[PDB]
Symmetry: D2
Subunit: 213 residues, 4 copies
């Protein structure tokens, strides 16, 4: 299960432990269709969040550094990001689409904005290459690369922390770029834990976008 | 996969996410070679790169005396769900004479076991009586002894589990929790043999897991 | 500041880092009505991170059944007396007859208080017989009841402290820990008045702190 | 607090506040409310046997100004609290490595020219940023063209135990030189405020080498 985000990014499900019933078993501390869902909604509405910590996901994410920086602020989770000492490195950059600027009356055509960004990216990247070729270590030369450079990471997180992530990132107040990733995370969450996801939207979700999309 | 511990306790595996390769994939940040994969596991363990092992997760169902659970619950990097004494088998851990078969006492070890059993029976009886009288469970239960068995679900990742083993699968820890740590270690070994072996070889700070098999 | 709780317990403030302004500085990231205005803004908009920069260290004496509920709050630091090696005062929480006010019981409340006291006496006396006989404390103490008082140090930041209050300073929590939560709230209010008020007005999810003064 | 240490060309690590000192760990370990000799002995005992929880009762709050590539590595330390400047909503300064930063590395061009080339691309990226902002482009979008050597600022509250883990990982020759410099500043302040704990740390638990 993979979802493409932005121009070159993505969110892919690597593994998952449990499902809605994992939270049910944990809540009852042990080991009926309607009875189980009722328990899930009960836990959600009353704020009994601990049982959902027993559902865990591992995602593989490709996102721009500025998005990853905001993402990594979520401390109750595990991350492993690219370094280039265990796997090969790649150089791609997030170039906003003209549509991304819709809504703002910019004196510069949204098409020209996309071009200027692409322009600087190319120049920074070429400078980077020029430095490496001259013998400058990568850890130094890389500092000239822009924040829109794509990176990749593995993210393992339990359902409770995931719902906190959605509360903050699947919201109109969050930067549009991370909103997109949050939407993809929500879709995968819904596919693996439909009962929990539904209960979440109904009683605990604090954001807005998940109720519109 | 369930292992009996003490007189009425146990450690049961409920679920597990991943295996040794999960840490390998995480370290390389790649989703998609035994010799080299096992070498990487040893390398990570040897140089202290522990984050990759956080991508292996276990969920256990444990039945242990409260005095043991209190020590267990001090391990904060994990998730717990315990039986609610306020809302809810009423069983207790009675040490066998063999548990004292090592200290010099003024009374036979068997006598100690009898004394413990006796007071537990009296406390339990008092509890049931209070409950019969309409006294709320949350109040009546305060007379129950620390050897009362409780149960909880424990979800923990491999890195945190290894920290648990470093501290509890050791002769300095109380004998009772050592027994549970041994069972946790056995299940860990079965599901992640490569990580477990690398752990014992490069990072394990305790003593018993290098003396006792599986 | 030492506040007495229950019959022999207490909550004592050991140390504190910062005040309301610590959160303001953190939110602004730079080392008054406008400042207080900011605190309220943060609280109403859900900006909780700035309050993580205010930290408290408390010394608490409480019955084990209360401590176990307390220790479920993982985002904090704890150091408690050792049941295996620490010297204890051997004091127990005996509910007052008023504790059962409201519950229709077969026997009178004073009777319940009496029975609890009797079982505690028997358990304690049995414990004494074991220790005097040579039984190690780590084993002998398992017969002691859950109402035995213990002590611990608790270091926690304001954000986690507020989460603790949301859960324990509430009618759904056991009356005994509610009492401790009230004391914690009292100390929080004295050191961080602006944050405390903003909390009650915008984020507090409990009920008792909106009716019980300070 | 008040302590401040300059790092790199425009960065710094400033001590904002501190709760406790070495005695805070001693009291927590004994879980109560002796003498200097026995107390320092207890600190070494704790450090030696890995009884690290008592040190969680010592807390620091730092104000740090560092380039984003350094901050990114720093923020991987989850057991701590952070508050950083929002790029979405500064004085825009950048870390320009000194020619000496390339000592030991045989480069095709003079080290001075490398510093120049870095300064040049940074200038072009910044000027592009300003042009986008002036045209009405949202800051959150325009800022993505800025380089990783852009300076940011943040408050960091962390306890002594977590700080020691931070030092074991960053105060090491295997860490990038830039973060090593910051780790040395953190260690310096730690030493100043908790002499006993720091000394014990260096003697029995520190796994790095530069300290
Ligand atoms: C030379 C060098 C190379 C590096 N290479 C890479 C790389 O290739 N990829 C990469 O992603 N990072 C890399 N890092 C960053 C490394 O992963 C960091 O040290 C780590 O992210 C932060 O450390 P920590 O886990 O010890 O600290 P904290 O996150 O602050 O945690 C402190 C302690 O609590 C723990 N802990 C916290 N949360 C959890 C949890 N959820 N589960 C289990 N235990 C937990 C552990 O016992 C830990 O030591 C590198 C660092 C250095 C110095
Ligand atoms: C032989 C023995 C004797 C003991 N004696 C005592 C005693 O006298 N008094 C007592 O109270 N307890 C005692 N304990 C219990 C001890 O406090 C526990 O081992 C500890 O609380 C749980 O371990 P941990 O911190 O390593 O694990 P976890 O809480 O699971 O944490 C794992 C890692 O994340 C970390 N971490 C998590 N949270 C924080 C945080 N807030 N700040 C900094 N780092 C953090 C550390 O790197 C840690 O190793 C004893 C245990 C043993 C085995
Ligand atoms: C629109 C928007 C604007 C933002 N602006 C800024 C800004 O200007 N500056 C900035 O620094 N960040 C900013 N952020 C980041 C914001 O602080 C993140 O939501 C936060 O860092 C990650 O959330 P968390 O604390 O809820 O999650 P996690 O770190 O994953 O924690 C989950 C839960 O555990 C908790 N928790 C974890 N660790 C601790 C701890 N040490 N102490 C107390 N509780 C803890 C809380 O209950 C928390 O909700 C912004 C985010 C958004 C969406
Ligand atoms: C009326 C009442 C009834 C209760 N009944 C029961 C019961 O039947 N069984 C039982 O076991 N407990 C029960 N509890 C205890 C309940 O589980 C506690 O509230 C909880 O253990 C501690 O709360 P916390 O998660 O909010 O806090 P903390 O552990 O201090 O965490 C603070 C924040 O960080 C978070 N966080 C920390 N660690 C993790 C993690 N590993 N994964 C995801 N998020 C994390 C969350 O955002 C959290 O709110 C009850 C409590 C009350 C008040």
């Amino acid at each position: 299960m993979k979802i493409d985000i932005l121009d070159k990014g993505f969110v892919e499900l690597v593994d998952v432990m449990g499902n809605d019933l994992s939270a049910v078993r944990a809540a009852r501390v042990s080991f009926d269709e309607e009875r189980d869902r009722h328990l899930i909604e009960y836990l959600m509405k009353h704020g009994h969040e601990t049982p959902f910590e027993h559902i865990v996901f591992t995602f593989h994410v490709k996102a721009p550094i500025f998005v990853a920086r905001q993402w990594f602020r979520h401390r109750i989770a595990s991350y492993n990001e690219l370094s280039g000492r265990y796997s090969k490195l790649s150089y791609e950059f997030y170039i906003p689409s003209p549509e991304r600027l819709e809504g703002y009356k910019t004196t510069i055509p949204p098409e020209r904005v996309t071009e200027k960004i692409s322009e600087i990216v190319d120049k920074a990247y070429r400078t980077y290459l020029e430095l490496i070729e001259s013998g400058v270590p990568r850890e130094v030369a890389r500092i000239v690369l822009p924040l829109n450079l794509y990176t990749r990471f593995f993210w393992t997180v339990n359902a409770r922390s995931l719902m906190n992530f959605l509360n903050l990132r699947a919201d109109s107040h969050a930067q549009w770029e991370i909103q997109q990733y949050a939407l993809a995370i929500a879709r995968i969450f819904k596919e693996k834990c439909p009962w929990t996801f539904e209960a979440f939207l109904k009683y605990a979700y604090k954001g807005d976008i998940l109720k519109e999309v």
